[PDB]
Amino acid sequence: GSAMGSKPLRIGVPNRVSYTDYVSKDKNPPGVRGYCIDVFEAAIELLPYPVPRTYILYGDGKRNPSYDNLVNEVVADNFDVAVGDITIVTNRTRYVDFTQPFIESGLVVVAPVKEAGTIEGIDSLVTSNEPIGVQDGTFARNYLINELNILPSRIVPLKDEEQYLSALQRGPNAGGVAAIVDELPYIEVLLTNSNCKFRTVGQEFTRTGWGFAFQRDSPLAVDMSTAILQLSEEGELEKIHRKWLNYKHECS
Amino acid sequence: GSAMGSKPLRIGVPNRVSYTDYVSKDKNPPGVRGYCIDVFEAAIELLPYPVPRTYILYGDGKRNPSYDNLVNEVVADNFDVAVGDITIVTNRTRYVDFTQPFIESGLVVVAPVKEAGTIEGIDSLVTSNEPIGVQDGTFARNYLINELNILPSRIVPLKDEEQYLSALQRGPNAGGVAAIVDELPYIEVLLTNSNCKFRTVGQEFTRTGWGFAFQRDSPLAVDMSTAILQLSEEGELEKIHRKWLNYKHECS
């Protein structure tokens, strides 16, 4: 019979430095772990065919990588899929085939409790002209510039939870920010870890989700959407969420 | 030049008798109207090519039609797309290409305020062994049977808001139901119209969304997902929601 085997699915995984319960490196095979990996694996197990595969980390592990650059590595055929906390953003849907979302997402504004009389939501944050913290690597920076009219110099990329907290505590006149703009899944973790000093202000002012980003016309994208809906019906998406994420804390 | 023109996009639209602000017949061209039609049209307008099209009603206009049968009319090539309040259900994703969702959905339990000590959510409703009201035509009937272990004889299909309200008011021992199980978008309208006598009980116990159902491998599905995300960023999905749906009422 023919000697040459099939190439395995090349899975690109963002090498996250913050909010690592969503997805991160693992010292042990398969070399990655977290909520999005367990969902991906649970969905792979429901496909009606084997999927030989390997997980390849993307980023230097010092800062969160560019998620737009990770998605374009799929577009450029360096990976077959991007697996992780990959937001379903307009520009990315032009070039990859996302699954149906496996978790809902949306941007929120986070500010100190003491500041909520002047920063009440995205509209007051826009007109404040104060600095706005964001993660490294997120779609949110270009979203703020292009959709919310934020002057680019106002956007302050921050490395990790210690810096998210430091920047909010210092505030806008002492080298920090008026607010952080980030997706609600991350903020649920940040508020779990910050002793009731910060809160969301105003409406979740965008709505989308996270999906797995396959190449254009991939039959895996179709079959993994069906599998994600199966996990959702079975209660498995909720079980996997409970395994990795807990938003209960002491001060409330 | 060649005489024979292109066939227009055949759009199948459910001929709804209840919750007609989501989608329904219109006496005036294009012969259909509502929230899902305005979203579809707004998304069509963002595509980088014209899409000659026509809207064809599906159902006798006496009861809500079978949404599974509407989706299978796309699969069977009688329509090119199903446009309306089409839930993204596991079985349907095997055969059609849904867009990314344009609105979040999920099932909820609705019961009289007075009954919330015995019916507190889906778990207590399951174990109650009492009758459960559902819409005509919804995925929810088979969902309850197959995912929640409901004996089929317990499920009572109801025609319209007058019957949803009548069945809850009569209750389970006087020819009515213990609860209605339906998607939250419909229940938001029902509670707007029912004078604070009924409420949701327990968690929204499923999560998915509504999408437009194109044929397998349709390039329109790809490009209309991009367009839906554009409408979401621009705030147009919110503007269209506000045009059609208002959940404010007098008793609260």
First to last CA, chain B: 65
Question: Which residues of A fall within a CB distance of 8 Å from B98?
Answer: 100, 225
Nearest to B233 among A100, A147, A222 (CB): A147
In a shared domain, residues A58 and A33: yes
Beta carbons of B233 and A206 less than 8 Å apart: yes
Structural domain contains residue B252: no
Report cis status (omega within 30 of 0) of the bond before B52: no
SS3 letters across chain B? CCCCCCCCEEEEEECCCCCCCCCEECCCCCCEECHHHHHHHHHHHCCCCCCCEEEEEECCCCCCCCHHHHHHHHHCCCCCEECCCCECCHHHHCCEEECCCCEEECEEEEEEHHHCCCCCCHHHHHHHCCCEEEECCCCHHHHHHHHHCCCHHHEEEECCHHHHHHHHHHCCCCCCCCEEEEEHHHHHHHHHCCCCCEEEECCCCCCEEECCEEECCCHHHHHHHHHHHHHHHHCHHHHHHHHHCCCCCCCC
* Distance, CA of B83 to CA of B13 (rounded, Å): 5
- Chain B residue with CA closest to A107: the answer is B233
Structural domain contains residue B152: yes
Among the listed residues A219, A13, A186, A12, the one whose alpha carbon sits nearest the alpha carbon of residue A103: A186
Structural domain contains residue A249: no
- Chain B residue with CA closest to A87: the answer is B229
Length of chain A: 252
* Distance, CA of A27 to CA of A239 (rounded, Å): 24
**What method was applied to determine this entry?**
X-ray
CA B86 vs. chain centroid, Å, equals 5
Structural domain contains residue A4: no
In a shared domain, residues B167 and B133: yes
Query: Which residue of A94, A126, A233 is the best one to mutate when testing the B interface, meaning the one whose CB has the most B CBs within 10 A?
Result: A233
Contact A110, A182 (CB under 8 A): yes
Q: Which two tokens stand for residue A96?
A: 């990859």
Tell me the backbone φ, ψ of residue B24, rounded to 5 degrees.
-165, 170
Contact A22, A9 (CB under 8 A): no
In a shared domain, residues B90 and B163: no
Q: Which two tokens stand for residue A225?
A: 């959407």
Question: Which residues of A fall within a CB distance of 8 Å from B221?
Answer: none
In a shared domain, residues A81 and A112: no
Contact A203, A155 (CB under 8 A): no
Tell me the backbone φ, ψ of residue A96, rounded to 5 degrees.
-115, 165
The sheet carrying A9-14 orders its strands as A53-58, A9-14, A81-82, A213-215, A96-98
* Distance, CA of A198 to CA of A184 (rounded, Å): 14
In a shared domain, residues B65 and B120: no
In a shared domain, residues A77 and A145: no
CA B150 vs. chain centroid, Å, equals 21
The CATH number of the domain holding residue B149 is 3.40.190.10
* Distance, CA of B40 to CA of B80 (rounded, Å): 14
Question: Which residues of A fall within a CB distance of 8 Å from B89?
Answer: 229
In a shared domain, residues A13 and A90: yes
Contact B241, B69 (CB under 8 A): no
> A81: which strand partners?
A11, A214
Nearest to B229 among A88, A230, A232 (CB): A88
Q: Is A196 in a helix, a strand, or coil?
A: coil
Tell me the backbone φ, ψ of residue B45, rounded to 5 degrees.
-70, -25
Which residues, in sequence order, are CB contacts of B126 under 8 Å at separation 6+? B148, B149, B150
Contact B137, B84 (CB under 8 A): no
In a shared domain, residues A197 and A118: yes
* Distance, CA of B35 to CA of B84 (rounded, Å): 8
* Minimal C-alpha gap between A89 and chain B (Å): 7
In a shared domain, residues A131 and A98: no
Structural domain contains residue A252: no
Task: State the amino acid at position A73 in one-letter form.
Answer: E
Contact B80, B13 (CB under 8 A): no
Question: Which residues of B fall within a CB distance of 8 Å from A89?
Answer: 229
* Minimal C-alpha gap between A229 and chain B (Å): 5
Residue A128's alpha-carbon distances to A148, A157, B229, B233, in angstroms, are 13, 18, 27, 21
Structural domain contains residue B1: no
Structural domain contains residue A75: yes
Resolution of the structure in the document, Å: 1.5
Ordered alpha helix ranges (H), chain A: 35-45, 67-75, 90-93, 122-128, 140-148, 161-170, 184-192, 219-234, 236-244
* Minimal C-alpha gap between B12 and chain A (Å): 22
Domain boundary at B167, B184, B201, which? B201
In a shared domain, residues A116 and A193: yes
Residue B71's alpha-carbon distances to B66, B78, B101, B139, in angstroms, are 9, 10, 16, 11
Beta carbons of B216 and A222 less than 8 Å apart: yes
Domain boundary at B183, B201, B219, which? B201
Contact A40, A32 (CB under 8 A): no
Question: Which residues of A fall within a CB distance of 8 Å from B100?
Answer: 88, 93, 98, 100-101, 208
Q: Which two tokens stand for residue B218?
A: 């349709």
Q: Which two tokens stand for residue A31?
A: 């070399």
Question: Which residues of A fall within a CB distance of 8 Å from B101?
Answer: 100-101
Any idea which residue has 């968690």 for tokens? B203
Question: Which residues of B fall within a CB distance of 8 Å from A143?
Answer: 233
* Chain A contact residues (CB < 8 Å to B): 88-90, 93-94, 97-98, 100-101, 104, 143, 147, 206-208, 216-217, 222, 225-226, 229-230, 232-234, 237
In a shared domain, residues A46 and A69: yes
Question: Which residues of A fall within a CB distance of 8 Å from B88?
Answer: 100, 229
In a shared domain, residues A126 and A147: yes
Domain span at residue A173 reads: 107-201
Q: Is A168 in a helix, a strand, or coil?
A: helix
How many structural domains is chain B composed of?
2
Residue B93: Cβ within 10 Å count = 24
Beta carbons of A222 and B93 less than 8 Å apart: yes
Structural domain contains residue A2: no
* Minimal C-alpha gap between A226 and chain B (Å): 5
